[PDB]
């Protein structure tokens, strides 16, 4: 709270939180790109893809 | 030089070389794999196996004489080769084995032996000649449904099927006087031929060839043949080109040596002076190409062939050789049209001046079976000689530029890319 109830430091410093979190969540955004990219994805029939690709 | 004669409904066309040391004589007919259909394929291929069969070849190697035979798209033709001095024994075997008494020719135990030999050079060949079977599915594939598209050997299918009464069929329809050139090449004259046509009353039947409905139609398509076991991969790429007698005959053979032919062995093939080389030998992106420029009555074709053991790397040799063709429409230097001028004449003064009369036999009296005469070699000259820039630019817009393609392939071609990324590479968005 930064006090005793929800007031003036609290409402400050929740705009700071809010303006960060969205540029982390831009960095995991990457990593879950990177752990997509190893096996590919996948398809509606479940079954292996390595067949029959198009770019 | 070239003499044509119209003295009956059979054409008489002669080529004297009196510093020769054969001569040969022949027929040629007006009619190939494209006046077939799909259930009777390669029933010319038959004849000509029947032609050149032991017992044939046994009568005429006691008179000293050799046979030869050959089936194209367009035509096909039948040789006889002799000393300077026995032109008459080689029209007479001709006259007696082919023109009549066909029927001992056709005999069972004859056809039944030929046919089974035939059966196993096609397997053969659909089994061992990747280079050549991927450009006959190139035809295949680019004139599906049409006259155009049907192997110049016939199938496994139509050949099993083939019986007695379909080959004497066949010639009834097309080996026909209006059909036919008697050609005669060598140390022979042309007074001296006619002469003797003349007195054996040489005839063959008088009738007139099928008129066939559809025409040879271009259609943007692919055919892949994949196979995983192969150690290569073999490509052919081609748009749509130029039939014979079209003006533009000679800029599009000439637009083709422009890019030539490659070997990666070969010392001096990798210092020519084309500046596609500088793109694909860092990395040995293909182990050979060759640039063709086939021309037939209807239509033709313009591309190129490959051959490659880089398999991870096809889609950049494919890319680079594109972005090639696209220069002749927008920017090409004049010394390479002046360099490709004098290759092309080097290239058709050899074909021309061969010294076999065989080559020369099939070369006249196809071009006799539908120019009705034959344009001399310094007649061609002049005509390569005037190409100039402007018609190489304006010959390639209307024919390469965002121009419909026809691929086939054969072999490790996982890497190949989809029809439309290659399509799209015919242009380009800076041009
Ligand atoms: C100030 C404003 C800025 C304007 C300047 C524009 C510059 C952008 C790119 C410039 C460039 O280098 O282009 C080369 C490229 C040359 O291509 P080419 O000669 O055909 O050969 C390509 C190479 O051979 C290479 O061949 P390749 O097969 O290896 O390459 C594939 C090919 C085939 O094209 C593609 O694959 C397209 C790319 C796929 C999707 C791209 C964006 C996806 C968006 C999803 C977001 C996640 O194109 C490429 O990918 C490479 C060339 C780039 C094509 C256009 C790039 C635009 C990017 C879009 C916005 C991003 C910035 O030129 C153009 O594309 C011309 C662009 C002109 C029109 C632009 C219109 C916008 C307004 C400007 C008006 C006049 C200027």
Redesign the pocket.
């Known amino acids: 709270w930064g006090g005793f109830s929800v007031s003036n430091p609290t409402i400050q410093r929740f705009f700071a939180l809010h303006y960060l979190v969205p540029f982390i969540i831009a960095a995991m955004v990457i990593m879950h790109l990177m752990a997509l990219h190893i096996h590919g994805s996948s398809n509606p029939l479940g079954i292996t893809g390595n067949l029959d690709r198009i770019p | 030089a070239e003499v044509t004669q119209l003295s009956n409904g059979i054409v008489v066309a002669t080529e004297h070389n009196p510093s020769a040391h054969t001569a040969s004589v022949g027929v040629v007919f007006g009619s190939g794999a494209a006046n077939e259909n799909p259930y009777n394929n390669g029933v010319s291929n038959l004849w000509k196996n029947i032609f050149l069969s032991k017992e044939n070849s046994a009568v005429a190697a006691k008179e000293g004489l050799a046979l030869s035979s050959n089936i194209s798209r367009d035509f096909q033709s039948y040789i006889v080769s002799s000393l300077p001095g026995s032109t008459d024994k080689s029209l007479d075997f001709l006259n007696q084995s082919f023109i009549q008494q066909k029927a001992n020719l056709l005999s069972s135990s004859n056809f039944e032996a030929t046919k089974k030999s035939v059966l196993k050079q096609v397997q053969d060949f659909e089994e061992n000649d990747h280079p050549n079977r991927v450009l006959e599915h190139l035809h295949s594939t680019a004139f599906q449904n049409t006259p155009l598209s049907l192997p110049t050997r016939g199938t496994l299918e139509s050949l099993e099927n083939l019986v007695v009464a379909d080959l004497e069929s066949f010639a009834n329809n097309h080996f026909l006087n209006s059909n036919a050139v008697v050609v005669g090449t060598g140390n022979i004259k042309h007074e001296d031929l006619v002469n003797s046509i003349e007195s054996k009353n040489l005839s063959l039947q008088t009738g007139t060839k099928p008129v066939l409905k559809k025409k040879a139609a271009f259609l943007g398509s692919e055919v892949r043949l994949r196979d995983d076991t192969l150690p290569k991969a073999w490509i052919s790429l081609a748009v749509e080109g130029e039939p014979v007698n079209s003006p533009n005959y000679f800029v599009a053979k000439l637009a083709a040596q422009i890019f030539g032919s490659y070997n990666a062995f070969e010392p001096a093939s990798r210092l020519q002076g084309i500046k596609l080389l500088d793109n694909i030998q860092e990395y040995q992106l293909c182990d050979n190409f060759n640039h063709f420029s086939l021309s037939y009555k209807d239509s033709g074709l313009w591309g190129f062939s490959t051959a490659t053991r880089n398999v991870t790397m096809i889609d950049d040799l494919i890319?680079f050789t594109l972005?090639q063709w696209n220069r002749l429409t927008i920017s090409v230097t004049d010394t390479e049209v002046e360099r490709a001028k004098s290759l092309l004449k080097l290239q058709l003064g050899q074909l021309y001046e061969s010294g076999n009369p065989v080559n020369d036999a099939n070369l006249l009296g196809a071009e006799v079976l539908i120019k009705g005469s034959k344009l001399s070699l310094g007649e061609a000259f002049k005509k390569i000689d005037a190409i100039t820039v402007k018609d190489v630019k304006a010959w390639a817009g209307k024919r390469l530029w965002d121009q419909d393609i026809a691929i086939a392939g054969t072999g490790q071609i996982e890497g190949l890319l989809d029809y439309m990324r290659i399509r799209?590479?015919m242009?380009?968005?800076?041009w």
């Open positions: 890319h972005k799209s590479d242009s380009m968005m800076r």
